[PDB]
Amino acid sequence: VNTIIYNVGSTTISKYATFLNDLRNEAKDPSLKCYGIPMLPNTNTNPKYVLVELQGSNKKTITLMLRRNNLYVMGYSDPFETNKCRYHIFNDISGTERQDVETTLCPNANSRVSKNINFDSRYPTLESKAGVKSRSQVQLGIQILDSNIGKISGVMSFTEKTEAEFLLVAIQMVSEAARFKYIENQVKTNFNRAFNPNPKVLNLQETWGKISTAIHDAKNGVLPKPLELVDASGAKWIVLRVDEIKPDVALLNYVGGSCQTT
């Protein structure tokens, strides 16, 4: 398992771009792709994970553990207390993947400590914990990310709302940005300020798997069925071809079977 180190406290749009390029290159399968868009690996391709070390201001750091197969954040770790590694596993991680989050994030069995994320990673759950009806009400931003890291990293007790806002911002600026070029570009455009994620960024996030299946299944560039999406203004956006949505996608979710690779 390799880790991508991103200095949140001191960056530029160029360093943000390099970060995402490195994360996509490490997460993606070495050869799997459809219509020239790289795809994530099959669940049993090793390594199954990739770590993202987010270095914030005031020596506050948090490491995210992501599953390569779908880029979902499985949990995170933060340097805690003396010289301990505090790992936090999502409520929706089960079986062997649970000891995996523990041993991958904190390899030293002698100094690791647990602090569960007492709720699952679904957006509606995160939005509920953050006390909002929509994550559109929670602004994203480099400085906002930095601030949320500092509210969690090394801090013994923190509220679920605090944790949820950190998770909402980090997932979207890391996982969602890696998957979608559009989302990366939204962050780059508002790099020095806070911004509310638009209807297109949220839709893309919610239709990623659908988009990925449609592209994998697309015959001669034509999507199996018209795919209804929504643009930046919130208008219904019906896509019929791969060429119409491909500019927004950086990585495709894993979809079994052969496809038009170029």
- 33 residue type, one letter: K
Q: Which CATH number fits domain 1-178: 3.40.420.10, 3.20.20.80, 3.40.640.10, 1.10.290.10?
A: 3.40.420.10
Catalytic residues: 72, 123, 176, 179
Nearest to 218 by CA among 198, 239, 203, 201: 239
d(CA 52, CA 174): 8
User: Where is the binding site, in residues?
Assistant: 73, 121, 175, 179
Domain boundaries, the chain: 1-178, 179-259
User: Where is the binding site for substrate, in residues?
Assistant: 73, 121, 175, 179
* Chain center to CA of 13: 18
The resolution of the experimental structure, rounded to one decimal in Å, is 2.1
Query: ω into residue 226 within 30 of 0, thus cis?
Result: no
For the domain made up of 179-259, the CATH class stated in words is few secondary structures
**Residue 108 structure tokens:** 């030293």
**SS3 of 107, please?**
coil
**Residue 138 structure tokens:** 């929670």
Which string of b and e fits 150-183 if b means at least 16 CB within 10 Å? Answer: bbbbbeeeeebebbbbbbbbbbbbbbbbbbbbbb
List CB contacts of 68: < 8 A, sequence separation 6 or more. Answer: 27, 40, 41, 45, 47, 48, 49, 50
